[PDB]
Amino acid sequence: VAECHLEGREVMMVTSGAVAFGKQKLAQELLMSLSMRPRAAAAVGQSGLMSLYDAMFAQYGVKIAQVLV
Amino acid sequence: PTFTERSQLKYARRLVVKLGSAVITREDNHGLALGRLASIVEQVAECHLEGREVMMVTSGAVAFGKQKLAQELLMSLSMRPRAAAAVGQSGLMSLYDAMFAQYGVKIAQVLVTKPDFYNEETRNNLFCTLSELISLNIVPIINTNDAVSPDNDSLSAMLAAEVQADLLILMSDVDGIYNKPPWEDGAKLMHTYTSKVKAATWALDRGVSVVICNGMQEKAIKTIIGGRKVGTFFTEATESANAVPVEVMAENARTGSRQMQALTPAQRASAVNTLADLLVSREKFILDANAKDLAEAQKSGLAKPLLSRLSLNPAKLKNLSVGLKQIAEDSHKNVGRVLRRTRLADQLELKQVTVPIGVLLVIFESRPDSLPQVAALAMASANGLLLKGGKEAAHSNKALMELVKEALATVGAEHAVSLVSTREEISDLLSMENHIDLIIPRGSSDLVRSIQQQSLHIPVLGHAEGVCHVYIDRDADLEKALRIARDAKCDYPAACNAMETLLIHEDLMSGAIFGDVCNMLKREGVKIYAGPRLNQQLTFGPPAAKSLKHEYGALECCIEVVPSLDEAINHIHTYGSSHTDVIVTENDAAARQFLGSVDSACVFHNASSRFADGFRFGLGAEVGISTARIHARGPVGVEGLLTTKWILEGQDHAAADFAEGGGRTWLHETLPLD
Amino acid sequence: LIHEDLMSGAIFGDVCNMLKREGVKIYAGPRLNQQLTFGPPAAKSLKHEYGALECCIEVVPSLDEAINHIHTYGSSHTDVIVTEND
Ligand SMILES: N[C@@H](CCC(=O)O)C(=O)O
């Protein structure tokens, strides 16, 4: 994607599946709650995933900006 | 809601913050003021780690993104807002993540908008998201979905509403709400309360406690959670009249002073007579009241000083009655008395007279015996008076207060007296101004010390340290000094006017009188230390004194010896609090030497430090012991509460009339003063 | 500050004339603002300070009212009374 953009074409990723990010990131509180007791994990994963994309893309110098719809 | 007073605020389990768009951006909206933001996140992490539940609502992301680009906005404003806020949203989120995680707490961005509260299915959805979050020890940051946006405060309010949160904190730039625009006399910062204002009403209408603080104020949360009077608190609970918050008290008292101003001739005299009569007539009520409150104190078992002084016996009441009758009979010509009578020129008759001070405020620990004494002082001195005791005696204080309110009601009838109970927050009390004149602390070192450390920009009568000194000269009779110091220490060794030191001529180490007085102190069981020079002197002797500027109160007395008069003088000035001292000798040359050289508040010659009682001076009933360098030294009677006021009754005189034009010259003839 | 009665004898006008003679930028008190048609401009704030040739002027009904205004605004610095009743 960074390549096709650096070429000069115009791209707008639509990354599905943030839930997995957050699900992994907690991995402890879901553990301790499934013994004493989904979307929220996706919210926290949304944050983290965004950061990760920022790091990686910026390593090509391109900048990004989260958009929610 | 349910909470009513700032006292209740240690008991809210769910909190919501909403930082303002001005507390975080620096004074450009073109960057980020960080220190404030850091303070905020630290306080928030604290309140959460406590176990309370918090959901920040950080406004103002635009500044983050605006700074982060700073280059493309540059290159576009030469070839050509919300987008910057989106990118800033991302970055700001990361930053919060780093910082919060440095306390171990985790967070999770959440985006909403005002329409998202209006439809009900989304209400369900978002509330489910929030509950699932809070259940997991996560602090969601709640920004608005700028993306869908044409100051986000209504948002936080109605958020707390849907959540039905305990307390909504709403930080901001302004300190609080005033009575009126600030460019206006009477900008009374309305701490409680019977734009932001509307939204606050709204949230209150949703059964929600709201508070609006100032961002720049440190520890604002930790401050406001304590119950401290800060920011602006909102509740119409309006339980009681609670006649004065703090201040209409003060103005009233001013009015009452103005009132009694026109009641000198036997008026206040007969009034305090009436007070003494009420004291000696209805004592049963107040006696049982103190018995009750003393029993209440017993289960508490606070302090044998307190647990001893809060006592009261009808003998004490007889003492108070005779003291009050004395004050009455002798308090005849204290006010209005003229001090100068002079004529500058024909029909130019200046004279300077006696006038009250104004709003006196006493402070003392539970000792209801003093209360009527100082009340008699006020009333005979025709000036207003406030009061604040401690915790105990409170009911006794009320009884005495009613008695004295009656007593003043007879003539003049104006209640130029009050009482500030229910934990008025002494520091806040002294934070006032423009009303109170003389802080008259009365309890003990602590009390007065805490005061002097807390008091700022307000006159504070009284001292804090009782380091006195006793010099003994080479030509002083031995047994004389023996009995003298014997009493000086062993009459009420916990007094203020005590000799926590004893200085002796170098010569008299030879006559073993040092040994004799050590024997005497032992007789009385006095833990004595030694001076560095004394440390050098003997083999091991008594142990070395810790510090020369220390205080004992109990049966302890440092002892040190120096060569000469002048050396003693210098040591005094170096360590003495200029409070009190005495010399014992038979040379009057040296006597006068000392007399002058000394700079104590009061100095004696062959007498006892325990003489500093004012009453002992025939100085009427004392009010305090002042060591300040102005207006008052040590034993202050009533006249330490009287200032002067120049008055002048000309006929047709003017300023330039005494210039070369008008035949007006100068006489300054000291008329016989009345 | 001037008694309310003496607004009738136009002495207010006389002293305005005098201040003009001396070139004194005078303001007016809220009560005085109410009093005349437009007159001198309204005083900004009663607890303000001028130093230069300026002097707010205001009139109140009674002695005691004046006293209260003084205590309200006066810095307890200095004052004088002019009258013939002792
Ligand atoms: N966006 C506005 C409200 C928009 C509206 O619904 O009128 C706010 O957050 O205060």
Side-chain angles (χ1 to χ4, degrees):
Chain A
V1 159
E3 225 11 38
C4 334
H5 170 278
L6 279 184
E7 166 200 359
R9 309 207 176 279
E10 307 311 320
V11 291
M12 278 77 72
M13 307 192 38
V14 190
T15 289
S16 56
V19 290
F21 192 116
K23 164 185 306 303
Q24 148 63 23
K25 179 182 158 186
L26 323 173
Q28 308 307 320
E29 314 321 294
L30 261 187
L31 174 148
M32 283 178 61
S33 45
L34 262 292
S35 304
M36 320 295 179
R37 289 279 195 176
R39 58 185 69 185
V44 61
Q46 154 55 39
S47 77
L49 178 64
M50 254 312 295
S51 358
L52 189 42
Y53 277 127
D54 306 303
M56 266 188 281
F57 271 115
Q59 202 60 17
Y60 284 54
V62 60
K63 321 171 177 309
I64 52 187
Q66 199 286 327
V67 171
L68 267 189
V69 303
Chain B
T2 59
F3 292 68
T4 49
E5 314 282 356
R6 268 167 179 144
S7 45
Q8 282 56 27
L9 275 299
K10 278 75 67 178
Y11 320 110
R13 198 46 62 159
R14 183 181 296 113
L15 275 301
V16 161
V17 191
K18 191 259 186 174
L19 275 79
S21 191
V23 309
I24 46 160
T25 81
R26 77 174 40 96
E27 296 62 20
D28 299 327
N29 199 32
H30 182 257
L32 191 147
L34 204 156
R36 331 202 281 258
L37 168 58
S39 70
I40 303 315
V41 63
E42 295 136 11
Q43 300 191 48
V44 159
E46 225 11 38
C47 334
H48 170 278
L49 279 184
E50 166 200 359
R52 309 207 176 279
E53 307 311 320
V54 291
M55 278 77 72
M56 307 192 38
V57 190
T58 289
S59 56
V62 290
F64 192 116
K66 164 185 306 303
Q67 148 63 23
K68 179 182 158 186
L69 323 173
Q71 308 307 320
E72 314 321 294
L73 261 187
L74 174 148
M75 283 178 61
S76 45
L77 262 292
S78 304
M79 320 295 179
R80 289 279 195 176
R82 58 185 69 185
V87 61
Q89 154 55 39
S90 77
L92 178 64
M93 254 312 295
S94 358
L95 189 42
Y96 277 127
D97 306 303
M99 266 188 281
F100 271 115
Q102 202 60 17
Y103 284 54
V105 60
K106 321 171 177 309
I107 52 187
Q109 199 286 327
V110 171
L111 267 189
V112 303
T113 64
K114 188 66 166 294
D116 310 334
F117 299 87
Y118 284 167
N119 196 328
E120 187 55 36
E121 46 84 14
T122 170
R123 180 163 306 179
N124 248 344
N125 297 133
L126 305 168
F127 175 82
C128 167
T129 334
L130 265 297
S131 298
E132 290 190 312
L133 268 170
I134 179 179
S135 41
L136 271 300
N137 326 312
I138 319 172
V139 189
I141 300 188
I142 318 304
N143 277 102
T144 167
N145 198 329
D146 328 323
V148 228
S149 81
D151 184 79
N152 82 326
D153 52 358
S154 45
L155 298 178
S156 63
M158 77 159 315
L159 178 153
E162 169 170 343
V163 187
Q164 191 71 12
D166 300 332
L167 162 71
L168 178 149
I169 303 146
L170 194 151
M171 295 220 184
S172 196
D173 52 357
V174 55
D175 48 45
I177 309 307
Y178 302 108
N179 185 27
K180 262 170 166 192
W183 41 277
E184 191 169 13
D185 296 346
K188 181 262 168 170
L189 176 81
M190 33 180 62
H191 290 278
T192 179
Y193 200 87
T194 190
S195 80
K196 298 177 183 177
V197 185
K198 312 203 113 178
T201 299
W202 182 296
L204 155 74
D205 300 331
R206 274 68 187 174
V208 178
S209 69
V210 190
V211 61
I212 296 196
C213 313
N214 171 284
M216 285 55 63
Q217 181 156 342
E218 313 311 282
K219 262 60 179 176
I221 304 300
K222 181 192 314 161
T223 296
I224 192 48
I225 67 180
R228 178 165 168 79
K229 267 161 187 182
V230 62
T232 313
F233 172 82
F234 292 73
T235 303
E236 3 219 34
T238 51
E239 288 94 352
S240 68
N242 64 14
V244 173
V246 183
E247 292 78 1
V248 50
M249 261 157 189
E251 293 177 350
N252 289 337
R254 193 83 53 92
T255 63
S257 48
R258 267 75 164 269
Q259 214 76 26
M260 48 189 59
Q261 184 69 243
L263 289 93
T264 79
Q267 307 302 110
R268 311 186 285 266
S270 41
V272 61
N273 294 132
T274 308
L275 173 64
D277 311 332
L278 264 71
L279 172 62
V280 71
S281 67
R282 197 168 158 272
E283 63 282 4
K284 307 91 188 160
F285 166 54
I286 62 180
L287 270 155
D288 67 60
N290 191 1
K292 147 199 192 173
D293 199 354
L294 164 57
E296 305 168 353
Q298 200 287 322
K299 57 178 163 34
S300 65
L302 289 220
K304 182 48 60 210
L306 293 167
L307 303 178
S308 55
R309 305 323 295 282
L310 88 168
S311 60
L312 175 66
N313 324 311
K316 321 297 300 164
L317 282 81
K318 177 52 64 182
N319 201 331
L320 297 199
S321 50
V322 292
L324 265 46
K325 294 185 288 291
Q326 191 168 44
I327 293 177
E329 54 82 20
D330 57 34
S331 172
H332 182 271
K333 50 173 184 181
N334 297 115
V335 197
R337 184 164 49 81
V338 70
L339 307 194
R340 289 209 188 191
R341 281 278 303 290
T342 311
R343 178 152 42 230
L344 315 177
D346 193 78
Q347 314 327 108
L348 214 54
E349 322 180 0
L350 178 142
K351 63 175 72 64
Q352 192 195 35
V353 298
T354 309
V355 293
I357 305 315
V359 190
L360 274 57
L361 185 142
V362 218
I363 277 179
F364 63 116
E365 282 314 313
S366 281
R367 298 173 195 173
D369 52 349
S370 54
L371 198 152
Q373 218 61 36
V374 307
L377 313 178
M379 67 182 308
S381 60
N383 52 322
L385 184 54
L386 303 199
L387 290 92
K388 184 169 190 63
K391 175 259 293 183
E392 315 83 313
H395 326 295
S396 76
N397 312 337
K398 301 172 191 62
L400 309 153
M401 178 60 176
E402 296 297 337
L403 209 63
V404 303
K405 286 178 85 50
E406 201 297 319
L408 54 88
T410 76
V411 191
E414 269 207 351
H415 41 70
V417 189
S418 163
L419 201 150
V420 303
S421 56
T422 67
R423 321 297 152 177
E424 291 303 274
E425 179 35 73
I426 54 168
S427 316
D428 180 23
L429 164 65
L430 58 87
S431 71
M432 300 160 32
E433 195 45 50
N434 320 319
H435 306 89
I436 47 189
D437 304 333
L438 268 303
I439 291 310
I440 309 183
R442 194 177 258 269
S444 58
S445 98
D446 153 75
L447 180 127
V448 305
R449 181 181 301 107
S450 44
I451 295 321
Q452 302 279 47
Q453 303 336 289
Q454 194 44 265
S455 44
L456 281 184
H457 182 249
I458 177 72
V460 178
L461 189 144
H463 66 76
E465 296 77 7
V467 175
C468 297
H469 275 82
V470 180
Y471 167 73
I472 302 167
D473 199 22
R474 62 186 180 273
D475 49 354
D477 179 76
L478 320 169
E479 58 84 18
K480 181 58 57 58
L482 285 177
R483 51 171 298 202
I484 280 295
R486 183 265 186 191
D487 308 309
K489 186 50 198 314
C490 189
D491 293 353
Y492 175 59
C496 283
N497 55 325
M499 22 108 33
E500 341 243 321
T501 310
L502 167 58
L503 295 195
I504 304 165
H505 201 65
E506 186 179 3
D507 181 283
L508 300 191
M509 267 306 306
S510 58
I513 317 303
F514 149 81
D516 311 338
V517 310
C518 302
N519 313 331
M520 192 64 206
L521 299 166
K522 178 188 45 52
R523 302 320 315 125
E524 315 317 301
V526 195
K527 160 48 68 176
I528 75 174
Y529 294 1
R533 290 169 47 114
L534 189 56
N535 285 313
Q536 164 272 353
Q537 172 56 30
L538 287 200
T539 165
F540 44 96
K546 167 57 194 303
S547 177
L548 265 298
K549 297 191 76 75
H550 185 65
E551 61 290 347
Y552 308 145
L555 274 269
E556 303 79 45
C557 179
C558 179
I559 298 187
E560 197 278 338
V561 334
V562 291
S564 87
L565 290 76
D566 299 334
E567 186 43 76
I569 317 311
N570 304 6
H571 181 283
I572 296 156
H573 296 321
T574 314
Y575 303 97
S577 87
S578 194
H579 187 299
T580 298
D581 181 285
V582 62
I583 174 178
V584 285
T585 181
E586 293 310 319
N587 175 8
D588 82 311
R592 81 231 302 106
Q593 153 53 38
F594 202 52
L595 298 207
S597 48
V598 292
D599 64 356
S600 163
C602 73
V603 297
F604 319 119
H605 178 264
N606 318 127
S608 87
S609 327
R610 213 52 170 92
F611 275 110
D613 218 345
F615 150 72
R616 281 191 173 105
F617 299 2
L619 195 50
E622 70 90 22
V623 57
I625 297 306
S626 87
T627 50
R629 305 302 306 275
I630 52 176
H631 151 63
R633 308 289 302 214
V636 291
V638 5
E639 297 71 359
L641 316 174
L642 310 172
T643 176
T644 49
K645 186 172 74 174
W646 302 108
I647 82 173
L648 184 41
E649 313 172 344
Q651 306 285 357
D652 310 320
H653 303 50
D657 212 356
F658 280 74
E660 289 58 37
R664 314 273 209 162
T665 75
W666 295 118
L667 278 78
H668 317 291
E669 45 183 358
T670 327
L671 312 176
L673 61 89
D674 187 55
Chain C
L1 295 195
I2 304 165
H3 201 65
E4 186 179 3
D5 181 283
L6 300 191
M7 267 306 306
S8 58
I11 317 303
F12 149 81
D14 311 338
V15 310
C16 302
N17 313 331
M18 192 64 206
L19 299 166
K20 178 188 46 52
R21 302 320 315 125
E22 315 317 301
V24 195
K25 160 48 68 176
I26 75 174
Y27 294 1
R31 290 169 47 114
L32 189 56
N33 285 313
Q34 164 272 353
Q35 172 56 30
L36 287 200
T37 165
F38 44 96
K44 167 57 194 303
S45 177
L46 265 298
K47 297 191 76 75
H48 185 65
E49 61 290 347
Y50 308 145
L53 274 269
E54 303 79 45
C55 179
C56 179
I57 298 187
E58 197 278 338
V59 334
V60 291
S62 87
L63 290 76
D64 299 334
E65 186 43 76
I67 317 311
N68 304 6
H69 181 283
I70 296 156
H71 296 321
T72 314
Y73 303 97
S75 87
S76 194
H77 187 299
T78 298
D79 181 285
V80 62
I81 174 178
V82 285
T83 181
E84 293 310 319
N85 175 8
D86 82 311

